[PDB]
Design a protein around this ligand. Structure first.
Ligand SMILES: C[S@@+](CC[C@H](N)C(=O)[O-])C[C@H]1O[C@@H](n2cnc3c(N)ncnc32)[C@H](O)[C@@H]1O
Length: 219
C-alpha cells in the first residue's frame, strides 16, 4: 500500500518518498502528522513512523491519571508521551530521548500540542538521575530492554507499574519476560505484585513483540 504521513506519501500531497530514502517528487520531507487528536512533527526521511504500533499508542493514551508522575524512558518524538500527557493528564511526564534529531521533534511536539506537563530530557536514560519519582515507567524499546531495568527501578516510587517491552519466542512469551522482571526486581529491592502480558505485533517468524504491565512495591 502507501503510508500517508502528514503531507508526505511513502511508496495529491506535498511530496512522496521511496524506502535508505529516495525522493521521487520535491524537496521537503518534514511534516506534521495528526493522529487521534495529537500532532507529530517529524522528518519522515530521518524518523520512522510505525504503523504497527498504533494500537499501543491508543492504549497508552488513557493508561495514566492526573495523580501520576510518569517516566518515558525511550520517548522518541513523543509516540507515547504526547497522547498520554494529553488524555491521562498526569502531573508530570519525564520524556527521555537519546537521539538529538528525535529529541528536536519531541521538543516541537510538546509545544505543538500545548502541553504543560511534559519535561523532555536529551540523554541516554541510563545517565538520567531521577530517584523514586515515578508512579509509572514506560519502556517502549525492544533491544536488550532488560539491561535497562536497573534504571527503571531507580525511577520507580515505593510502589508503581512498569510497561516492559520485549521481543520473545512464542514458546516462552509468558515466561521469560516475567523471570527477567523478577530477577531485576530482587536485584533492586522490589517484588512483583501482579502482571499482565499483551501481544503487540508479530516481530518475526515465531517471535512476538510483547508488553508486560507489571506492578511492584519495594521490599
Ligand atoms: C522512537 S521509539 C520507537 C517506538 C515505535 N517504533 C513507535 O512508532 O511507536 C525508540 C526510541 O528510543 C530511543 N533510544 C534508544 N536508546 C535509548 C536510550 N538508551 N535512552 C533514551 N532513549 C533511547 C531511540 O533513539 C528511539 O528514538
Amino acid at each position: 500500500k502507501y503510508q500517508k504521513i502528514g503531507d508526505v506519501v511513502i511508496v495529491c500531497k506535498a511530496i512522496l518518498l521511496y524506502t535508505h530514502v529516495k525522493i521521487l517528487y520535491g524537496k521537503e520531507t518534514e511534516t506534521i502528522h495528526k493522529e487521534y487528536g495529537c500532532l507529530f512533527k517529524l522528518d519522515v526521511a530521518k524518523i520512522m513512523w510505525s504503523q504497527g504500533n498504533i494500537e499501543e499508542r491508543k492504549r497508552m493514551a488513557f493508561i495514566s491519571n492526573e495523580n501520576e508522575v510518569v517516566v518515558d524512558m525511550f520517548a522518541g518524538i513523543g509516540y507515547f508521551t504526547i497522547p498520554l500527557a494529553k488524555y491521562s493528564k498526569p502531573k508530570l511526564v519525564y520524556a527521555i530521548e537519546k537521539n538529538p534529531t528525535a529529541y528536536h521533534y519531541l521538543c516541537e511536539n510538546i509545544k505543538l500540542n500545548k502541553l504543560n506537563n511534559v519535561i523532555p530530557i536529551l540523554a541516554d536514560n541510563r545517565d538520567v538521575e531521577l530517584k523514586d519519582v515515578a508512579d509509572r515507567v514506560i519502556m517502549g524499546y525492544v533491544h536488550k530492554t532488560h539491561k535497562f531495568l536497573d534504571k527503571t527501578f531507580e525511577f520507580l516510587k515505593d510502589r508503581g507499574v512498569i510497561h516492559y517491552h520485549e521481543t520473545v519466542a512464542e514458546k516462552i512469551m509468558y515466561e521469560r519476560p516475567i523471570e527477567r522482571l523478577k530477577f531485576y526486581a530482587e536485584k533492586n529491592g522490589y517484588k512483583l505484585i501482579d502482571y499482565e502480558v499483551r501481544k503487540i505485533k508479530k516481530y518475526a517468524p515465531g517471535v512476538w513483540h510483547v508488553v508486560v504491565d507489571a506492578k511492584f512495591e519495594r521490599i
